[PDB]
Write a protein that binds this DNA or RNA. Structure first.
Ligand SMILES: [K+]
Ligand SMILES: [K+]
Ligand SMILES: [K+]
Ligand SMILES: [Mg+2]
Ligand SMILES: [Mg+2]
Ligand SMILES: [Mg+2]
Ligand SMILES: [Mg+2]
Ligand SMILES: [Mg+2]
Ligand SMILES: [Mg+2]
Ligand SMILES: [Mg+2]
Ligand SMILES: [Mg+2]
Ligand SMILES: [Mg+2]
Ligand SMILES: [Mg+2]
Ligand SMILES: [Mg+2]
Ligand SMILES: [Mg+2]
Ligand SMILES: [Mg+2]
Ligand SMILES: [Zn+2]
Lengths: 149, 57, 79, 137, 48, 119
RNA sequence: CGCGGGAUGGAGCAGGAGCUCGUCGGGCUCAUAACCCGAAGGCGGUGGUUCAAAUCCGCCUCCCGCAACCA
RNA sequence: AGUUCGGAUUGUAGUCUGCAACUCGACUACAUGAAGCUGGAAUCGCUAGUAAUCGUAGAUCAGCAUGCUACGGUGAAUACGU
RNA sequence: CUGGGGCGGUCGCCUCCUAAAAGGUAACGGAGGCGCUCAAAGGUUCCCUCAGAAUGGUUCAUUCAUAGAGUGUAAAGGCAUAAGGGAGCUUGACUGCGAGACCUACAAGUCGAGCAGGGUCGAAAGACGGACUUAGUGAUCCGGUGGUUCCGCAUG
RNA sequence: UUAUUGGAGGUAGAGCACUGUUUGGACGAUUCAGACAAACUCCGAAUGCCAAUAAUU
RNA sequence: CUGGUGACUAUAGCAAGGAGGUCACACCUGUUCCCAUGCCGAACACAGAAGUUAAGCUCCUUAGCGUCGAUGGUAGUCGAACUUAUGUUCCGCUAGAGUAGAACGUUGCCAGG
């Protein structure tokens, strides 16, 4: 992926310069992206915009299906993030205070039409989880990666 | 992965999607919004709007 | 006048220890009656369907510690 | 009248009244206290009357801690009924008081004023009491 | 709801197995493999 | 952040749960397998005495080479079974070590089975 | 004193919330009533069982039925 | 097709009268684009150049008419009977 | 039965407290439940770990969290060996028994290693004679139904 | 029966680690202090009980 | 000294600071083959070796939370005498709480150095 090459390039060099690291293994990287649409139509829309079959999340009457979700990591996650940065985001900037206090970020999209690939426009949420130990470190890494903060 | 989704080309750049053009790589892929310049000048302001309307310098 | 809505109890089940530590028992002797594993089956001791602990061989009963908060009962051959 | 907002069991065995006070034998919140020297049940009505006497004598200027609470319900049979046919209904709430227990504590007044307020409270109680101060050394 | 069930296989008249089932949950004639002492083998015993 | 898993400790908990009802005695010792990222080691233990009688490894000078991991596990199983046969060992109980009975662990078990251990 | 039953729009009745009258607005009438057309508006409470309570557990505040004796 | 029906409401920029359009004028341009898809109980007008419908003019009047008064164009249906 | 009798309530089984740290232990003492359910909620192999809170997001993610969840059902005793959650295969919710024990006036009730016959799951050791355990039940006589190398009144 | 030794169990007491009850502070529910319980227990005796091999009986 | 695998009531844990990595243990690289995801090569599994001690892991130091824990005294109590007092006395046993203190594991077997 283009973002994968960007991260393997001096992006990590920027993180090391700005946070004074002693090894390249302590440079934070995005662990995964979990897309949750909180239902055949919703499952199909999520699958067609993401790429894989979603997982139906039941309730903890209890036990009924309520939402759907997808986890991405590796080449697919990197391609998804590049597509979200380039093709998808401007159709919908973004909150820079929505941090977990540990280094993971969450963003909610209300209309699914902002994806290149509906009768009732439902809203989904994206969680980008990284190996960053601080909100500051995660935000700096994401901004370097190109998040439209 | 269990056993569509290819590498379509959306400027131009490679990407993966399901909503399915030669490249420098030599292969072809399936191929509005460049998002805003200043676009429009901001509001003049009431004093400037008043002075310009009546020519009062 | 009035009346009471209580006045019920089940038959007592005579649970608890049936043989002593250091006692000799024939195989099959029930060593402990219990609900759940208040005491665990140790060496040469079995656990029945109703949690009864019984000796699998003839020998001497030994009630012993099992970790910090549990205990067990074993049977060791006299020889 | 002090009483628990709820209890698990409303019908309880009456508590054992032999022995000495398990705890609460020292002044810990105030400066002076009233220490029981004999044993009795202490009812919430007795507690309220004693507290009113104390607070009235100090004009609500100092401050009082009631160290005992009536956790225990007790039952009483309806009048003119024979024995049996189940336990009676809750009649009131008591605290078990044994020698040594501090019943009340007061602070914010002089020793003489506290002594008089505690004497007035003591005369409302079914136990003998002694004026005490915080123990040092 | 729950009724008594007797299972007998084709090549026996032993009818030695009784069991229970929920008539609402299992409206069919239940089948199971059970040991048949006459034939010294497992056989397909089916509810009568 | 995102914590890791410590595969070795997850394995250890699984292995303790297996050892709850798996143990080796004098007449039937336990062939315990440990498998790291690059090497596989097998031991023959009499848990009744707490004593190890035979051992083999993919890092042993005689049984170390540059080969497939499955093949190295096969060689280690053969070496351990040969050592057990040199001793008085015919029947054992296989302690998979908390890993799935697949891949390298399966290869070692099968190699010992072929070379002579009865399990 | 013992046993049991009831608390439903504002009123009388049905009962895990509907009929009639009452209110509001409009109409008919010289006007009122009657009549006609629309709108709103409710599980006695106190704690619990329960995914969920008018509904079920116990109690509380009143009313209602039988009985409250052999001396 | 709540739409190329509807133009209420609101924003902006103007024109004219008037000493002066904030309360509180009329009109214009651009934008916006509400309720409304023939209306319950009930109730009104009209017998012929009438009803219906379409425009026009005047008084008052600096400016302000969906009102009033007046004018023509198109132009029906029905009345068995008390 | 009954702190006289009547009226009221109760009558069998399970769990807890009273019950005095083995077991047992009464009252018209204090609290509740049962007269079922499940074709998997049984067996086996493999994998897995919860409630709650905070922090962000129009259920999803992170960290603390030994259980503060769950365990079909009342309570108690147990259970993160998981006995709790999921998945594949399956029917041991087998047949003949059974050394030896618990309980016990009797009749009953309870546990049970092992042996044989045939299976299921598992690579294998092995586990499995229903369910985390303890309620969900009713004698004999009589009658119905199926089987039967048994009897069957001179013989068939 | 006693002596010694081993064991099972949760009472007395105590305690607040669970459930429930309760009194004062402080802080932005947490923490601090202090209390209550047959059906509370992080704890836990004396006894009594079950057994094993010497003295007496 | 490291590693595997056992035994022992956490004196063994947890937390906070440092040192280490050649072989080893790891993080790691990939998804072509066995295998695997109610979705995901995250985990499971297989191939490996660019890289890094950053983490897990090992060694050193902290009594901070947890854990262990006396002696002395107290509560309670078997027995005995007095006694009817919400009791007293004698004798034996002897808590819980709290204090001193202990503790940052010990140790069997096998393999490597
Ligand atoms: K009586
Ligand atoms: K008892
Ligand atoms: K407490
Ligand atoms: Mg069982
Ligand atoms: Mg059973
Ligand atoms: Mg205290
Ligand atoms: Mg138009
Ligand atoms: Mg009577
Ligand atoms: Mg006793
Ligand atoms: Mg007992
Ligand atoms: Mg009942
Ligand atoms: Mg019943
Ligand atoms: Mg089960
Ligand atoms: Mg004859
Ligand atoms: Mg004959
Ligand atoms: Mg007590
Ligand atoms: Zn058959």
């Amino acid at each position: 992926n283009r973002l994968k090459e960007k991260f393997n390039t001096e992006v990590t060099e920027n993180l090391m310069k700005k946070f004074n690291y002693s090894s390249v293994m302590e440079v934070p990287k995005i662990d995964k992206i979990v897309v949750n649409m909180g239902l055949d139509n919703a499952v199909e829309e999520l699958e067609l915009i993401t790429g894989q079959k979603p997982l139906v999340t039941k309730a903890k009457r209890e036990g009924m299906p309520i939402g759907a979700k997808v986890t991405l990591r590796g080449e697919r996650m990197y391609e998804f993030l590049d597509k979200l940065i380039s093709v998808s985001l401007p159709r919908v900037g973004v909150s820079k205070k929505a941090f977990d206090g540990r280094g993971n970020y969450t963003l909610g999209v209300k209309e699914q039409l902002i994806f290149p690939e509906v009768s009732k426009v439902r809203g989904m949420d994206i969680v980008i989880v990284t190996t960053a130990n601080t909100d500051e470190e995660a935000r700096e890494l994401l901004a370097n990666f190109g998040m439209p903060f | 992965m269990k056993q569509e989704y290819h590498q379509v080309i959306f400027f131009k750049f490679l990407s993966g999607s399901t909503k399915t053009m030669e490249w420098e790589d030599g292969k072809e892929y399936p191929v509005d919004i460049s998002h805003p310049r200043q676009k429009f000048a901001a509001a003049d302001g009431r004093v400037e709007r008043f002075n310009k309307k009546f020519g009062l310098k | 006048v009035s009346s009471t809505k209580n006045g019920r109890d089940s038959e007592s089940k005579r649970l608890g220890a049936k043989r002593a530590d250091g006692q000799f028992v024939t195989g099959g002797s029930i060593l402990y009656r219990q609900r759940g594993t208040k005491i665990y089956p140790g060496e040469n001791v079995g656990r029945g369907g109703d949690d009864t602990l019984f000796a699998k061989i003839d020998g001497v009963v030994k009630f012993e510690r099992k970790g910090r908060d549990k205990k067990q009962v074993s049977v060791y051959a006299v020889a | 009248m002090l009483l628990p907002k709820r209890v698990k069991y409303r019908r309880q065995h009456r508590p054992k009244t032999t022995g000495r006070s398990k705890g609460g034998n020292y002044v810990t919140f105030g400066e002076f206290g009233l220490q029981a020297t004999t044993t009795s049940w202490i009812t919430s009505r007795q507690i309220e009357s004693a507290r009113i006497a104390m607070t009235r004598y100090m004009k609500r200027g100092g401050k009082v801690w009631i160290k005992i609470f009536p956790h225990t319900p007790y039952t009483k049979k309806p009048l003119e009924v024979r024995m049996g046919a189940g336990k009676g209904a809750v009649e009131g709430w008591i605290a078990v008081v044994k020698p040594g227990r501090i019943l009340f504590e007061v602070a914010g007044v002089s020793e003489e004023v506290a002594r008089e307020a505690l004497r007035l409270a003591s005369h409302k109680l079914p136990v003998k009491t002694k004026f005490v101060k915080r123990e040092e050394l | 709801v729950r009724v008594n069930v007797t299972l007998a296989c084709t090549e026996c008249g032993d009818r030695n197995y009784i069991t229970t089932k929920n008539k609402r949950n299992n409206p069919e004639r239940i089948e199971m493999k059970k040991y048949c002492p006459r034939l010294n083998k497992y056989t397909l015993h089916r509810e009568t | 952040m995102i914590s890791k898993i410590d595969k070795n400790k997850v394995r250890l908990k699984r292995h303790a749960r297996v050892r709850t009802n798996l143990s080796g005695t004098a007449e039937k010792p336990r062939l315990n397998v440990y498998r790291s990222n690059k090497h596989i080691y097998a031991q023959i233990i009499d848990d009744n005495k707490g004593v190890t009688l035979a051992q083999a490894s993919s890092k042993d000078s005689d049984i170390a080479t540059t080969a497939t991991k499955v093949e190295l596990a096969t060689k280690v199983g053969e070496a351990i079974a040969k050592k057990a046969a040199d001793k008085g060992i015919k029947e054992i109980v296989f302690d998979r070590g908390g890993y799935l009975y697949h891949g390298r662990v399966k290869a070692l078990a099968e190699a010992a089975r072929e070379s002579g251990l009865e399990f």
